């Protein structure tokens, strides 16, 4: 009856949530995209649909999603996926800020929870709902996620649906809450690509492991952090990797 809860949650920040990648033909995703990192692929469950999780040195990082027969998947290339205080939270301050959603909320084999949200344009934005978890996964260093950063062409607007799924805006209030967030944008578009694509740890020999494979150049300097290397890959998939030990 319109109650409040009097526990506040703060979650470790940094910690990314999840991030798949769908492709036309995982057999031959898994050459390329392995071959980037250099991962090892794993047998599938039997009595389900085959599932490749790719995994190394008995430590998670990371699963290959697949259409088949599905011309319009969910995914469309990599993104990030940040967590929200409720899959129907998220998608309940979309219109409050004026955005659209697109997906969701959907009941994933009753285990988790993604939507999309942003502009009818076909704008994907991962969006998790962290009950149990906020992806905290195993620290290996290189070979894990490194976090999430989008490129738009509009900060202001971006930071808004940001601001307003997650940041306190969501709620008008604080006090339950500390700000344990993952998210990050930037505005770029001539002297950068843009789209959805987080960032992973590599060591140097990664960068040319993919130029071998036909990878193409957009950008690969101009970061916070000093060496980046974006490649785009053949099927349409675009990712960063920066250079870190
Ligand atoms: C949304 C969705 C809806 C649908 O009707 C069918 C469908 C998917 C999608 O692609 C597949 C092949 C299955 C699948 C599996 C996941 C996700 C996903 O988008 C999809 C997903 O978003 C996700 C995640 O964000 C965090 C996780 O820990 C695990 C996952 C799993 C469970 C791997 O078919």
């Known amino acids: 009856g319109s109650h409040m809860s009097h526990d506040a949650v703060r979650p470790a920040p940094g910690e990314p949530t999840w991030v798949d990648l769908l492709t036309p033909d995982r057999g031959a995703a898994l050459q390329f995209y392995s071959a980037l990192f250099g991962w090892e692929f794993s047998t ?32 469309g290339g990599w993104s990030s996926y940040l967590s929200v205080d409720d899959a129907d939270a998220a998608a309940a ?69 940001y601001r307003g799924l997650f940041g306190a805006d969501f709620a008008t209030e604080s006090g339950t809450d500390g700000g344990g967030r993952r998210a990050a944008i930037r505005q770029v578009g001539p002297a950068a690509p843009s789209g959805w694509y987080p960032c992973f740890r590599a060591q140097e020999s990664a960068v040319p492991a993919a130029v071998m494979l036909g990878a193409s150049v957009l950008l690969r300097y101009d970061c916070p952090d000093g060496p980046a290397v974006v490649v785009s890959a053949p099927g349409g998939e675009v990712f960063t990797l920066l250079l870190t030990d």
């Open 44 to 75: 599938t469950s039997d009595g389900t649909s085959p599932y490749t999780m790719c995994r190394l040195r008995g430590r998670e990082v990371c699963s290959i999603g697949d259409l088949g027969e599905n011309p319009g998947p969910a995914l």
């Open 93 to 161: 301050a979309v219109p409050e800020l004026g955005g659209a959603v697109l997906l969701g909320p959907i009941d994933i084999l009753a285990q988790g929870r993604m939507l999309l949200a942003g502009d009818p344009s076909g704008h994907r934005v991962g969006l998790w709902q962290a009950k149990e978890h906020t992806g905290s996964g195993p620290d290996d260093g290189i070979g894990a996620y490194t976090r999430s950063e989008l490129l738009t062409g509009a900060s202001a607007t971006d930071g808004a649906f």
